[PDB]
Structures are given as structure tokens and as C-alpha cells.
Amino acid sequence: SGQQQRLLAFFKCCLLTDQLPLAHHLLVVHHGQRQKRKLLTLDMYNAVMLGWARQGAFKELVYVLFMVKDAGLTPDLLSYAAALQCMGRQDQDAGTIERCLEQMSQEGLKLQALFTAVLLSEEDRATVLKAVHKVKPTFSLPPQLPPPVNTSKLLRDVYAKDGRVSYPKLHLPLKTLQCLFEKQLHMELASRVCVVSVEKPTLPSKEVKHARKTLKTLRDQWEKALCRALRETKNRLEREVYEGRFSLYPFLCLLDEREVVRMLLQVLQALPAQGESFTTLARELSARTFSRHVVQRQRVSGQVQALQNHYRKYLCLLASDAEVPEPCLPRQYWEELGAPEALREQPWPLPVQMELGKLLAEMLVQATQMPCSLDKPHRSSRLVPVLYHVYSFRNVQQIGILKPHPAYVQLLEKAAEPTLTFEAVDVPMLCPPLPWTSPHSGAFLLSPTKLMRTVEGATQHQELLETCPPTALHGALDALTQLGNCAWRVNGRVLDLVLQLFQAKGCPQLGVPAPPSEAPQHSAAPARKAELRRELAHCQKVAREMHSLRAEALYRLSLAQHLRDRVFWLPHNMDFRGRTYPCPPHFNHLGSDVARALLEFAQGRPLGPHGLDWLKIHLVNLTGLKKREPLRKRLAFAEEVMDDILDSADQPLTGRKWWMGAEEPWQTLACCMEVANAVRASDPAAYVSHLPVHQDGSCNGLQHYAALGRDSVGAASVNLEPSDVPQDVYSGVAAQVEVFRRQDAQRGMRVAQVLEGFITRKVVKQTVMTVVYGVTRYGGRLQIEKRLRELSDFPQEFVWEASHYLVRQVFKSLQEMFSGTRAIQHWLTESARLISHMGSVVEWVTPLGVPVIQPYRLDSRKPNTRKQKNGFPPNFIHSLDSSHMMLTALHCYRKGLTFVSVHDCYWTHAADVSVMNQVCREQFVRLHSEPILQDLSRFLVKRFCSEPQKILEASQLKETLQAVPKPGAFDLEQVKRSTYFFS
């Protein structure tokens, strides 16, 4: 029942505060009445017994156990652990504790099993062990088994003890990293962070000063008013808890009063002119209260100091001055050398969260008062509330909102307020991240972080991780920890140039927007009125779009300005496939050209003997002019454009401008500047290079299809077989479409003139690449039209010639050169179709050990067939991509290489790219050497055919699923000689 859930939440969360005598009163009140005695026994009695056990009160547990005996339900082993805990922390009676042990040995409970099954507090567990040792030293279980190691064939070389292995070492000393850890601890305890804006502070005038003065004075006023209202309302609820139930006093005093007045003032500041819904502010306020509780519990519990000590012991592994006694993995040194304790608090249920949000919003309304109007005269001598809740219309449903008073909006607009408030999670780290010990363990220091990203609910994604074998998830967690330990900094000169273009109007073609001033901001005929309405609508939408781009640009470049001359570590999380995403959203390498160009490595390898050439290749790889030619011609092209490189690096914006026109202009500028700095040196090899170097994939999903069942045709078309000249399927398909279009133009169709040879690789990449997946022609026409929407040549589009040639006409030729891969596609589609008809969701295991499930359910909930037969291949082939990426990551880490990887685009320093390449080919050969298709067939049979629902669904699925397409006469071992696999 819901009321039982709310009562359990109350009695659980009152332990996390110190209001135990307040907890006893409501328990006694509910036990006093027989109608209130129901739904009271459900797991709250051991909670309050543990509550009296943690405090220095051993006498009350006799009354607690008498109450449990009055309830008549059997005592829990947690209650026996609480009894052993209250025997602890106090002078032992030297008697009847063994009688209590005999009593708990009766009725089936075991003394040995409570250390492993109760999952009590570990300090209380040590106290219980101390009490037992005071009773008898006979029993002492050792939990320190040797650390379990994965036994998979692919991961065997990573975890092998033997062999010469070298690990990367960070540049900074140990003490500097400890000071950085201190700074991030202070930055995380206060969850908000204030960022100076990159908006120009323009024209401080007398009206501005008047607005600032009255705003500061009224701000002190409403801070005092909010504190007074919190005191009065908390006193009212403390009076209510004496004569009632569910009263919110422990929920409101969970935090201190200063943090909630700052939280309410911040949520008052964040409201736009049009206030959002009451439900939205309730959700935001209570979720922020929950995150605040998780942050601020560990100060008073004492885990922050223990985390600091364990971090001090662990940080010697990544420190330059200190030496670990034997080299080992970043996670395994955390697994040994002590272990921290994670509470893993379950969040309180939905009605408690919603209702606490409701009272916080109502408190903010009834407290916060603005005097009269904005004008200097004060003749009315009355104070009106600033925010009124308003019955409004929203978009489809009538939902009450919270609208601020317009004079407050006018005053808020009058003051500039250069401060920006960012969350603690969104801003990057200041210390190296917490290692991924377990899916429950997180990369952040004081805040939780889930392993796999979900939209809403979706518990089965983490349930498969929970039920996964303990050593199977070890490799993925190590790879995520590796991705966390990357050291970053922002460029000085690129940031300066981007900000200089930001302050002025700038150029919008680079990704830096303009201020809205440069944005557009008697009737003769009704047609003239219609034209005027149309151009007002166009002006309004364009102004809204430009303001929308400008706001995100300001919010990114402000954080970039804040994060100059410091070192940073981006933690990484997982999607449900296995593909990794950076947890800080605003500033990461999965961003734009500008955002990618700002980042460089904090630690710089020397260029080595090979060196500068590779950097130049990377420049051409982002220049975009030459993609279909070999590496020697790319180096020759980089040699020919050297004068433009020197001119662009010496004078980026004032002088001759070459880094325009490239597909990624600012990254081209960054590589340009790093190359020009590298050349101007006495020794090119001894120079320190901080620039990341890119390695991208040619057509990766088609390669992965070609491996799952080898081919001689198609596999050689995706550069798996070695070749001197790279072979791209997209250019061949584009050429075939163009030579059909030439004949259609000779025939005389009107659409052939409006295509006009504007077809390229980028036009058809999405559609030809989704041909190998299950594609509907609507999906083809939504991607072949968007590309021609960004091109500005021909105005009026009907794109069905390209789709009707691309999935119908060249689809004969697509069947001609892609034979066997479509058999794999039909096999997977039919398997998923019969699984959907059986009623299950498809689960598959990656070769590394990550289990993947699909969150496609109909509106307990039936699977949706349409988004499950389709979207099964581009949900498994990406899992194979991620398994290959993590294998490349681990074998890159073993050779002393620093490795950060965009998915299907790896990054490494200039010297280290050849070793990372050989790692990549070795992992590709290793991953597909194990037969993925037959193991997948066996797992699909074991999961989706082991129950006899009916004879037809068993028989047809067995007959279709036992068949695997036959691989061809092509050797996977050639990939080690493949030069243009990932280049």
C-alpha cells in the first residue's frame, strides 16, 4: 500500500537525521491503535531497532522486541544484528549474551550468516564482531579472499601477471594532486558553482548601480523572510508530528537551514519570465534536496575524512614522485589497500518526493515578498508576493504554473548579473576520478553516477549488471576507469580567439553565434497584412533560434573561461549498448568543432622518431580536402600547404585565413598551431606535444558485418583486406547513383536538373549505411532530404529520386556486391521477430562480458515488435563496436600509452599512434576469432527456446535459429597486415 510506503520512508529517513526520540513517539502512536497497528510491522521494526542500536541506548530495544512480540511476526535477522549492535558500544554484562546467541540459533538463524546476509553498517558489524570476541573468540570469518580474476579468453592477456608491462604516469607531483583533491572536495560540498560570464560587462551607469543596490537590499530582505518562514513552518510540522502521522519535520530538517535558503533563492533566480509548472518545480526542488542530502550526509557521518585518507594512499599510484611497490591496475589498487564503504541509499518513493516539492514551492510563494512596484516612490506602503501560482493552459493540458511578478522581471533584466550557476556534476573534475570498482561504485567523489544511461525507469539495464557474474564486468569497469584518468586542459590562444569573436558580432558559420542585435528583431490590402504577419513570424522564429544558439555558446565558453590554467579529468559512463559517453555534458570531446578544439592533453609525450609527420597527417585528416588517397599523398599535401599553415598559426584572424573551408575549422587551427610550434624547434623529436591525434574508421558497421561470416566481396570493399589505396563503399554507391542520374538527365526528367551533380558522400552516407540495417523508405527520405536542406544550391526539394534509386534501383547492385551480409540481416530480423512473437525482449552477451537488453516496450508491459525486429542489428553491432573499443583501450593502456576514445574515433599522442594501431588490429583479430554467431545462437536458444509455451513457437524458432550463415574463404588474420583499417 502507499501509506505503508510513506511510513517506511519516514522511519528510514529519520535514521539519517538524529530525531530518534521523535521517531519513537509516532511508532508508539501507531502501535497504540489496532487500526493503526496494521501496515506497521512491514520492515520498520528492525529499522527502529537499528535506530536505537546506533545511538547509545541499549535499554529501549527491550521495549522494541516486546513490541515485535506483540505484533506476532517472526523477528528478522536484522533485528538480531541490531540486538548484537546494542550489546556493542557498551560495557559487556559478561552473561546472557551467549544465551541470546543460543536464542537466535533457535528458529533457524545462524551467527555465521549474519555477517554476510544482514548487510548492516560495517562499523556496526565490527562492533558486533568485537562483542562476539568478548563472548567467544571461536568464530572469525575472513572476508579477504584473493581478488577474483576474469577467465575469459579475450581478457586473459590484460590480467596476466607475467610480461613486461609499463603504465602511464601523470605529470603533476603528489602534493599538487592532493591540493586539487581538496579544491574539488570544497567545490562539491557546495553543489552550485559560480562562473564568471564571457558576456561583456558593458556601460556601468547610474541606473545599473541603483538596480544593484535595491536588488542587494531586497535580496537580504527575502533571505531573512525565507529563513523566518522555514522556522515557522518547521515548528508547525514539529507540532504536527506529535498528534499525527507522515509529518514532514524530519524530511525538512534533513539539511541545515542555510543550504535550503540558498536552494530556494537559487530556484527563484532560475525562473524565466514565463514560469514553469508547479509539478516541474516540485520535482526539481525535491530532486535537488535528495542530491544535497547525498552530498551532505557524508560530512556528518564521517566518510569524507576516510575517503580523503584512502585517496591519499591511492594517489601514489598516479603520482610522479611516489612509487607503487608493485605496478598494478588503477582499480585493483583500490580493491586492495583498504576499501571504502558505500551506503547505496534507496530513494524515497514518489508521493513523498512530490509532496515535499509541493510544500517547498508553497513556502517559496508565501514567504518571498517584493515591496510595492519597482518605482522609487513608496506611497502604497504594501508588500506583495513576487510569485503567484496561475491557472494556465500549457500546450495540451491545464496545469497550474508559478508566475513571477513583472516588476521583479524588470529589475532582474535591469541588473546584468554576470554570475552563472552550474551544477557540481556538470562541471568537470578537479582531481583524478574515483575508480569504477563496481556498478554501484561511481566515478564522482560524493555523488552517485549510474553505469548505464536510461531515460526513465528501466531497472532491467542495471538488473543485468547486478545479476552478472562478478568477474565479467571487471574489464568494462577497468576501461571506464581508463577513460576517466585522461588529463585535460584548455588552449589559451584558441580560447582567446573564440572569446574575441564572441564579444563582437563574430561569424556564425564557425559555430560561434552573434548577439541578438545583429539578429532581426494603415494596411492597403489583406494580402499585405498576411505578408506582414508572415514576416513577423519569420523574424520571431529566427530571433528565437539565434538566442537559443547564443545561450548555449555562452554557457559553454563561460565554463571554458572558468577552467583556464588548471588540469581536468572527464569521467565516462556507458549507454545500454556499451558505448561510452562523457558524464560532464557541456564540455567534452563529443561536442562541436569549437569544443573539440579547446581540449588538449595536460601531459605531453615527446614526438619521438616518427613524430611530426603523423601530426601533419591528422591535419589533412581534418582538412577534408583529401580523404580518398593514401597516407604518402596526404603527407605530400601537408608539405605543399606549409606556407598557409605558418600564416594561419602566426596570425589567425587578422592575416591570411586558410583554416576556413575545412569541415572542422577550429580543430584544424589547433593542429595548425601545434604543427607550427613543433617545427620551430631545435629538435622536432624532443618537443612536447599536447595535441590529440585522430584515428577514425572507414565504414565500421559494414566491416563488423563482413567479419561475422567472412566474405571475399564486400569485406575487401570495406578495407579489411590489405590494399594500398583505400576503398570506400559510399563513393562507389554515389558513383552508381550519379551514372543512373546521367542517363535519367539524358532522358529529360525535371528532377535530374535539380540534383545537378550535388550528390557526394555526405549526401548518401546515412541512407546507404542504414541499407544494411532494416530501413523503411521514409527513414531514407528523412536523411537524404536533410543533407540537401543544409546545402544552399537548389531551393525546392523532392528527394524521392535518390531514395527510389538508392533502396530500389541500386539495391539490385547492392545485392550484387553485398551478398551474405543481407542474409545475416534477414536472419537477425527473423530471430528478433519470432522472439517478439514469443513475448520476450532480446538479451545478448558481448564477447567481453557486458549484457545488453533492449528497452522497447508497449505502453507487465508487452514488447513492441516494430522497434525490436528493426533496431536489433543497430543495437548489437554497436555492442561489438564497443567491445572492440574497450579491448583496444586495455591493450593500449598496457603499453604505457594514454588513451581517450571517441567511439569509432580513437585519440592518442603523436609518438604513440603506431602502437595503438597495432593494438587495434590485434583486438579486431582476437574478438572475431571467437565465433560470435554460433555462441549467440546457443545463447538465444538457451534463453528464448528453453520453455515449452507451444509446439509451433518452439519448433519454428528452433528451425530458424539453429541456422547460421556460412562464412566464406577469407582469413581474418590478414587484418594485422591491413594498413587502412582505421585511418
Binding site: F278, Y388, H389, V390, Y391, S392, F393, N395, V396, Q397, Q398, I399, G400, K403, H405, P406
Partner: protein, 202 residues
């Protein structure tokens, strides 16, 4: 003019001098509410009905008149009938199903409630601009009506006198309608009071 700004139907003042029975209802897309208050201070009834089968994606007229008849079965009979027209316009592309819902209910209910329309030849149901009936009060800012929950709480517990026969039930239901965001019944008493002030008892 001014009374024409308030009232959309045109009723001359002599009948409005003594009406002796007024019912005020407020349409809502999820829930319905009504209250009877005379030209004198007396409040007769206050009820709301919930759990419509409607706005479920299918628009059908039969269940429309089934729901309107189920509402009218509890309604009493009075001299003039108060309606609250929305502030929405047909030109607004957004909120169109809500506007169609409001227009269809106002048509169905204005079509009913008048058994003797062909006999008297005079209109009986009158509607209100919500902005103007707020404008008798002070509740607007930026041409938008606020809740009036605090105002109706101050008026309930003079601007309006609630009879003591049902005031206990009014308070008991008011605690629930104050815990939840139920704004429809709160505007009914306010628009009734402004009807009895601005066009009546001048």
C-alpha cells in the same frame, strides 16, 4: 457598453434588478464545478463532479450529452445562469482541442437549461469574460489572472457570507481542494460575487 463589456448576452437592467436565483458554473477540461448564490448573500450549494470519460482522444456527441445530462441531473433551476468564457481565441493554433472542448460544452449547456425559450422569447444563460471579472478585483498582472485561492480563502473565512448549514462541509472539502491544485471551483464564487456587484446593486 460597460455592462456590455462584462455581459456577452444583452439583458436589460429591470430584470437584473431582482434575479433572486443565480447559479455559477466553471467549465474545466478535466473536472467540473458549480455553486448557487443568490442576489442576496446566501449560498445554496457547492459541489464538483470528477472522473469524466472524456478528452480520451475520441470526440463523440452522444457521450457529450450523456455527461452533460449527468451533470444537469444534480443542478437546480435559477433565473439567470453564469458561464465563464475562456480567454482563448480561435486564432491560437495551440490549445485548439481545449478550445473546441470549451466551445462544445458551452454550446451543449447553453442549449440546455432553458425549457421555456420558445415561450418567453428572452435569453436566459449569460457568459463572462474572465479578464473583466478579474478586473473587478485586483488579481491580474500582465493581463493574466492569478489563482484567487488566497482571495477565496479570505472571502470564505463582508464580501460574501456563507450560510452555516453547509459551511463545515465547505471547509472540509476546501482543505482537500487547497492541498490539490483545483482552480476551477475557486473562480466560481469570485465570478458570482462580481456578477452581484458590478451589474447588480448599482
Amino acid at each position: 457598453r460597460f455592462l456590455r463589456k462584462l455581459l456577452k448576452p444583452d439583458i436589460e437592467r429591470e430584470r437584473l434588478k431582482a434575479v433572486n436565483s443565480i447559479i455559477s458554473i466553471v467549465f474545466g477540461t478535466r473536472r467540473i464545478a458549480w455553486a448557487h448564490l443568490d442576489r442576496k448573500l446566501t449560498v445554496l450549494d457547492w459541489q464538483q463532479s470528477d472522473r469524466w470519460s472524456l478528452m480520451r482522444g475520441i470526440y463523440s456527441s452522444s457521450v457529450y450529452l450523456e455527461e452533460i445530462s449527468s451533470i444537469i441531473s444534480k443542478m437546480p433551476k435559477a433565473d439567470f445562469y453564469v458561464l465563464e468564457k475562456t480567454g482563448l481565441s480561435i486564432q491560437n493554433s495551440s490549445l485548439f482541442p481545449i478550445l473546441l472542448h470549451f466551445h462544445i460544452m458551452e454550446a451543449m449547456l447553453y442549449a440546455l437549461l432553458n425549457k421555456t425559450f420558445a415561450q418567453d422569447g428572452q435569453h436566459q444563460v449569460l457568459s463572462m469574460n474572465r479578464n473583466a471579472v478579474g478586473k473587478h478585483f485586483e488579481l491580474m498582472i500582465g493581463d493574466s489572472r492569478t489563482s484567487g485561492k488566497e482571495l477565496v480563502k479570505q472571502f470564505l473565512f463582508p464580501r460574501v457570507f456563507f450560510p452555516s448549514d453547509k459551511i463545515v462541509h465547505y471547509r472540509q472539502m476546501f482543505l482537500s481542494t487547497e492541498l490539490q491544485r483545483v482552480e476551477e471551483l475557486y473562480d466560481s464564487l469570485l465570478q458570482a460575487i462580481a456578477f452581484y456587484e458590478l451589474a447588480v446593486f448599482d
